[PDB]
């Protein structure tokens, strides 16, 4: 419910956050299940808006 | 000019002020662009709302 309240603008900051976590692989394995659940619902909830954008920097982050 | 946005999700657990509902709407002009708003009257999904301003983002109104 907390994450559904999030506007799509804060999703992009969330995706950037998750990307930065990726480099810290120590933090990655420590909380891998949680990162999976929260990241992936977020894609679910506002998939339509996320796919809409043409932003190159977002395209490399998702990859 | 005033825009039209169709509600897609009535947000819950939001604790807005009594008689106020925090909701998510999608502009008719652009089916991609969504915005979160606050509504006064009773609301269901699939309605459409007339927005005077399209830039302000909803905040929990105490």
């Amino acid at each position: 419910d907390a994450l559904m309240v999030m506007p799509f603008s804060y999703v992009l900051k969330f995706l950037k956050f998750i990307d930065t976590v990726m480099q810290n692989k120590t933090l990655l394995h420590s909380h891998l299940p949680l990162i999976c659940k929260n990241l992936f619902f977020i894609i679910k909830f506002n998939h339509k808006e996320l796919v809409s954008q043409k932003n190159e920097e977002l395209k490399l982050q998702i990859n | 000019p005033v825009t039209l946005a169709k509600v897609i999700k009535v947000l819950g657990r939001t604790g807005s002020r009594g008689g106020v509902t925090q909701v998510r709407v999608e502009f008719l002009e652009d089916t991609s662009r969504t915005i979160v708003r606050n509504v006064k009257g009773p609301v269901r999904e699939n309605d459409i709302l007339v927005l005077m301003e399209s830039e302000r983002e909803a905040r929990r109104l105490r």
């Binding site: 419910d1 907390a2 994450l3 309240v5 999030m6 804060y10 | 604790g15 929990r60």
Partner: peptide
């Protein structure tokens, strides 16, 4: 006080 999500937005 600030709730779940609202606290996150600040974070």
């Amino acid at each position: 006080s600030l709730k779940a999500g609202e606290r996150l937005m600040e974070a």
